[PDB]
Every structure is written in C-alpha cells, then in structure tokens.
Design a protein around this motif. Structure first.
Motif, PDB file in Angstrom:
ATOM      1  N   UNK A   1       0.819  -1.199   0.000  1.00  0.00           N
ATOM      2  CA  UNK A   1       0.000   0.000   0.000  1.00  0.00           C
ATOM      3  C   UNK A   1       0.858   1.256   0.000  1.00  0.00           C
ATOM      4  N   UNK A   2       2.176   1.086  -0.033  1.00  0.00           N
ATOM      5  CA  UNK A   2       3.100   2.207   0.123  1.00  0.00           C
ATOM      6  C   UNK A   2       4.244   2.166  -0.897  1.00  0.00           C
ATOM      7  N   UNK A   3       4.469   3.279  -1.597  1.00  0.00           N
ATOM      8  CA  UNK A   3       5.612   3.376  -2.488  1.00  0.00           C
ATOM      9  C   UNK A   3       6.722   4.172  -1.824  1.00  0.00           C
ATOM     10  N   UNK A   4       7.846   3.511  -1.582  1.00  0.00           N
ATOM     11  CA  UNK A   4       8.996   4.209  -1.056  1.00  0.00           C
ATOM     12  C   UNK A   4      10.117   4.177  -2.066  1.00  0.00           C
ATOM     13  N   UNK A   5      10.930   5.224  -2.056  1.00  0.00           N
ATOM     14  CA  UNK A   5      12.052   5.347  -2.976  1.00  0.00           C
ATOM     15  C   UNK A   5      13.288   5.770  -2.189  1.00  0.00           C
ATOM     16  N   UNK A   6      14.444   5.214  -2.545  1.00  0.00           N
ATOM     17  CA  UNK A   6      15.671   5.531  -1.856  1.00  0.00           C
ATOM     18  C   UNK A   6      16.216   6.845  -2.358  1.00  0.00           C
ATOM     19  N   UNK A   7      16.249   7.833  -1.477  1.00  0.00           N
ATOM     20  CA  UNK A   7      16.807   9.132  -1.813  1.00  0.00           C
ATOM     21  C   UNK A   7      18.337   9.120  -1.803  1.00  0.00           C
ATOM     22  N   UNK A   8      18.929   8.695  -0.695  1.00  0.00           N
ATOM     23  CA  UNK A   8      20.383   8.706  -0.546  1.00  0.00           C
ATOM     24  C   UNK A   8      20.794   7.692   0.505  1.00  0.00           C
ATOM     25  N   UNK A   9      22.066   7.317   0.474  1.00  0.00           N
ATOM     26  CA  UNK A   9      22.643   6.409   1.444  1.00  0.00           C
ATOM     27  C   UNK A   9      23.672   7.164   2.255  1.00  0.00           C
TER      28      UNK A   9
ATOM     29  N   UNK B   1      14.700   7.337   2.872  1.00  0.00           N
ATOM     30  CA  UNK B   1      13.572   7.077   1.995  1.00  0.00           C
ATOM     31  C   UNK B   1      12.412   8.045   2.213  1.00  0.00           C
ATOM     32  N   UNK B   2      11.894   8.553   1.117  1.00  0.00           N
ATOM     33  CA  UNK B   2      10.609   9.214   1.128  1.00  0.00           C
ATOM     34  C   UNK B   2       9.595   8.107   0.888  1.00  0.00           C
ATOM     35  N   UNK B   3       8.462   8.144   1.579  1.00  0.00           N
ATOM     36  CA  UNK B   3       7.407   7.152   1.337  1.00  0.00           C
ATOM     37  C   UNK B   3       6.096   7.854   1.049  1.00  0.00           C
ATOM     38  N   UNK B   4       5.441   7.447  -0.026  1.00  0.00           N
ATOM     39  CA  UNK B   4       4.163   8.030  -0.382  1.00  0.00           C
ATOM     40  C   UNK B   4       3.180   6.887  -0.575  1.00  0.00           C
ATOM     41  N   UNK B   5       1.886   7.197  -0.634  1.00  0.00           N
ATOM     42  CA  UNK B   5       0.889   6.196  -1.003  1.00  0.00           C
ATOM     43  C   UNK B   5       1.246   5.653  -2.372  1.00  0.00           C
ATOM     44  N   UNK B   6       1.031   4.352  -2.555  1.00  0.00           N
ATOM     45  CA  UNK B   6       1.326   3.697  -3.823  1.00  0.00           C
ATOM     46  C   UNK B   6       0.863   4.542  -5.019  1.00  0.00           C
ATOM     47  N   UNK B   7      -0.428   4.856  -5.069  1.00  0.00           N
ATOM     48  CA  UNK B   7      -0.993   5.564  -6.218  1.00  0.00           C
ATOM     49  C   UNK B   7      -0.883   7.076  -6.088  1.00  0.00           C
ATOM     50  N   UNK B   8       0.295   7.582  -5.739  1.00  0.00           N
ATOM     51  CA  UNK B   8       0.437   9.013  -5.500  1.00  0.00           C
ATOM     52  C   UNK B   8       0.917   9.798  -6.727  1.00  0.00           C
ATOM     53  N   UNK B   9       0.087  10.723  -7.211  1.00  0.00           N
ATOM     54  CA  UNK B   9       0.488  11.589  -8.329  1.00  0.00           C
ATOM     55  C   UNK B   9       0.083  13.057  -8.139  1.00  0.00           C
ATOM     56  N   UNK B  10      -0.054  13.473  -6.889  1.00  0.00           N
ATOM     57  CA  UNK B  10      -0.347  14.847  -6.572  1.00  0.00           C
ATOM     58  C   UNK B  10       0.799  15.747  -7.022  1.00  0.00           C
TER      59      UNK B  10
END
Ligand SMILES: [Cl-]
Ligand SMILES: [Cl-]
Lengths: 305, 303
Positions: free
Chosen positions: B153-161, B270-279
């Motif tokens: 239910x959640x889309x997260x993406x790796x910003x930086x390490x 990580x930033x995490x947004x709702x899976x279907x997030x396109x705001x």
C-alpha cells in the motif's frame, strides 16, 4: 657440541679478533669466548692461540676451521636440498557454505578443474566466520559465503544478489499467491523455519536481518538443523521457511516455492579473498565465475584485472 | 519614507558616485541629492561620509544598506510570489524522523514553502511504522524515514545512502584514524551507545542490523534516550556511538567523528508516499529534493 659452537669459532678466526666477531654476531665478548672455550674443553684440543694478537689458530685449530666451515656449509646445503623435494604439488583450498551447493558453485569448480588438470583442489564446507579466519591464516585461498565480512585483511566481492523465496505447503493460503508473490509483512505471523542450526552467523541470521531491515520481527520462529529439514518439515505442514531461489534444486511433493515482492528481500552471494591476493589461480577462479555467469545470463562481477 | 529612497540609496553605494548612480536610474541629480538628504533627517542620522567621494558609508549607513538590499529583495519576492499562488488554501502534511533534522530536510522544506507561498505545510515527527499507518489513513502525504517498508500500500524510494560514523572522545585511540576511518570490526569490543529509546524500529535497530550484516553482535551496549544524550555521554567519556554523517551538525568540545570504511556501513533515507500518488504537491516535493540534492552534488533518482 653445537653448531653455535662452530659458528662462533668461525667468526673469531675470520675476524682475527674477539670484538669484530662479537659485534658481527651481535653478542657480548664474554659469552662468545666462553663458548669456544667450552668447545675446546669438549674436544680436548686448543683451537685458538689466545693471547697472541691478532687472534690466530693452533695447527689443530687450523685444520678444524676448514672442517667446521665445510660442515656448516653442508648444513646450509642440507636445509636447501631438503627444501627442494618438498612441496611440489600446488593446492588451492576453497571454502564455501552449504547453501551455495545448490547454485552454480559446483559447475564453476568443475570448470576451473578442467582448466587446471595438474592442480589439487580441496573443498571445505565452512561458514563465513571460519572462512575469514581460514583466509587470514592461509588455510584457504578463496571463500564463498552469504554474509558480509568485517575484516580489513579481507576483501569481498559481491558476485550476485539472489532472490529470497518462501517455501510453503501446497494447501497453505499463501500458495494462492504463488503466481504474483507475497510480501515479507504477509509472513510476519506464520510459524517460520530457520536454518541451519550450524555456528552463527549463518543463513538464519540473514533471514532475520531481512525481516528486521523491513521493520518486522516474527515471534513464531523455530530453528532447525538443515535446509532439507526445513523443507521436509514444511512439506509435512510444520510451517513456512525462507530459502534462496537456488534451493529450488530441491523439489518435494507439495512443497511450493513462492516469490517475494520486496525489492530488498534478497540474499547476496560473495567471494572473499585475502586483501593482497594476486595468484593467477584465484584470478582463474574469478574468471571462471565470470565465464559461467555470462553463460547463465547473470550480470558479470567486476574486473579483478 | 518610500521605496524610492532605498532604491535611490542602493545605487550610490553600489556605484560609487552621485552622478553615476543618477545615470543608473535615468533621472536628474539635483533632486537625487535632495532625496538622500531627505532620508537622513527623517532618520535623524547620516548614512554617508559627509563630503568623502570614494565613496563610502558610515557605520550605521553601511548596516542600513545591507538591510535595504534585503528589504528591496523581498518586495521583488512579494511581487513574484503573489502572481503564482493557488486557490484559497491546501494542506500537505509531512512525516519525518528526528534524525533527518540534521541533514538536508529542513532546507528542502524551506525551499518548498517558497514554491507554494499560500500552501499550508504541516510537519509531523514520527517513526516509520507510524508513517505507514498514517499514509494509509491520509493523516500524512509523504513520510521521510530511515527504515525499509514491506509495502504494498506504500511506495517508497531511496533518496540517498548516508554514511555511518563513529562518535568518539578525541582521546580515544580510534581518533587516530580520523582522516582515514575504521571498520565495524574495530568496534566489536567498544562500549556502544545506541539511540533512541522510542518504540522500535528506530535508529538503534538499524545499527544492530548493520553490525549483524557483518557477522558482528556487540555485547557492551547501552540504549540511551537520544542523539544529544549519546553524544553528550561520548564527550563525558562514557563510550562510543554510531551516527549518521549529518549528526556532525552537533559539535562538542573533545567530540570527534570517525568515518567508517565498510562499504555498507550506511544509513538510507527514503521518502514514502501512497502507492498511487500523483499529486502535483508531492511531485513538487520530489523536485525540491532533486533541486537540493543537485546543489549538494548528490545523486537524483527516477521518482
Ligand atoms: Cl549460485
Ligand atoms: Cl541528507
């Protein structure tokens, strides 16, 4: 008598002085002279004309010096000669963990083996902790494992990340999700089989890190001795287990493998070597890993060379 | 006074003469000299050196110039911002973890405020697990975290390490490797101060994990309330501690940070947004990070 008795006498004769002999031996004059004295009192003949400077030999000592020099030199030769017949056959010792046996390692070893028909190859099932110890200690030349190594004297290369899978019985609710996959979070409350019971840190440690990395910590765990017991217990309905994808070399009736959706539900495969290693025998192994992988269609590990 | 006077005042100090400042504004210098004269009496203080022609400002005059370039700079921002507003008022709520306050986050947020002048932004400090159940419920719209998230239910993406580092008292032997760094192995026997003491998972979990990845499980460990405590105690000669690189925002007498050499001695963001997030607001947030990351020379992701 001793060879030390001889080396001392020989140093005095050549230097014709007790000082230039004790300094070239990095010892004190007293013990030096006392030892040659002990040598003489053991032979019953005086070798040195002591008191006459520069120090010179008695006729009996002059002959003895010649035999002494030869005898020391024949000791030198003995040692050398003995070292020539010794240790002809080259051996490469490779340590690996049991789980790797279900993947590509065997065919890799076999190929490297065909490439080196005059090489003795010893293989040792060992864990990563022992591999690091055995590498630093020379006991092995190349290790293969699933767990990273904390040790500056050692160098790990990641060969390939391998996908984790959930072994389940065929009747299990999760098996309905075989086509698509489940998430780690979907497993959190099932009976989970961890393995092996072998010395930590092993594959069970890794699985738990995977859950912990994902904010999860399953309480219904039960460590079992080996991977076949895991699978075997699963196919009897004890619970589920997490296994490498390669473990799918084992098919048991009603045992069903099921993918994980979590992009980081992975187990890495490393090769570890001593930090300053440069044997062509290891690069040849490395090249053999590169050869097989391309053959299989995996991404190649980076350049040694 | 009026803006005229400040603009008029700015040119005389930028361009160092009365006539050359008058050329800039395309106006007569008889009234220009009066205007700058008219300014000082209103204040009851002089702003320029009386008769000196290099030119140069007085103590109080110079201070006013810099104050003036700031005000004038903001009237332009008033003009520029008012054209691009939005619709009477939306609220975007953002969750983050405390450790992120030392990195690039607040500057991202500050520049975000600028893109959306009329936007009501609402900042909430919360751990990852809480960010999840908060994104799913609509109570936040982005979550900045350091922990991985079994979704879906959640889309997260790796910003930086972010690199990990060891906080140590400058007397500590490890501090020799200050410009060369160490490996986790060296920490095996050390007194390690883990933080924080909130509900798990949190940064302590992560460090216990990092050690675990490497086949190490330290035994001499204390969990302390948070980063300042941990650092405080390190200064107080109480132990060592594992921190993200950005913790070096906090500098203490006899505190020193040792880099780690292990390749995976890292703390991900990580930033995490709702899976279907396109705001658009979220997309805009994404780009600010890329804008900021670019500025600091770091890597942009396909968001
Ligand atoms: Cl393999
Ligand atoms: Cl950052």
């Amino acid at each position: 008598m001793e060879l030390r008795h001889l080396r001392y006498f020989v140093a005095v004769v050549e230097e014709q002085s007790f000082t230039k002999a004790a300094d070239k031996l990095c010892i004190a004059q007293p013990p030096l002279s006392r030892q040659i004295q002990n040598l003489e009192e053991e032979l019953g003949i005086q070798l040195l004309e002591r008191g006459s400077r520069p120090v010179k030999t008695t006729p009996e000592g002059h002959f003895f010096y010649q035999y002494a020099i030869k005898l020391l030199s024949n000791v030198d030769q003995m040692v050398s000669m003995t070292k020539r017949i010794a240790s002809v056959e080259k051996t490469i010792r490779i340590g690996f963990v049991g789980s790797l046996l279900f993947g590509l390692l065997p065919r890799i070893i076999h190929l490297y083996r065909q490439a080196h028909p005059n090489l003795r190859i010893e293989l040792y099932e060992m864990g990563t902790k022992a591999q690091t110890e055995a590498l630093k200690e020379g006991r092995i030349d190349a290790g293969f494992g699933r767990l990273k190594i904390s040790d500056p004297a050692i160098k790990r290369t990641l060969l390939r990340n391998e996908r984790l899978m959930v072994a389940v019985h065929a009747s299990h609710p999760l098996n309905q999700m075989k086509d698509k996959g489940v998430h780690l979070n979907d497993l959190i409350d099932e009976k989970i089989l961890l393995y092996p019971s072998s010395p930590k840190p092993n594959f069970s440690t890794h699985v738990m890190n995977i859950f912990s990395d994902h904010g999860l910590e399953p309480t219904k765990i039960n460590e079992v001795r080996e991977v076949q017991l895991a699978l075997g217990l699963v196919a009897a309905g004890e619970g589920i287990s997490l296994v490498p994808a390669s473990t799918q070399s084992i098919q048991l009736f009603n045992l069903s493998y099921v993918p994980l959706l979590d992009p980081d539900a992975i187990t890495p495969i490393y090769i570890a070597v001593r930090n300053m290693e440069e044997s062509t025998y290891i690069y040849s192994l490395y090249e053999t890993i590169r050869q097989i992988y391309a053959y299989e269609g995996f991404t190649e590990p980076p350049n040694w060379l």
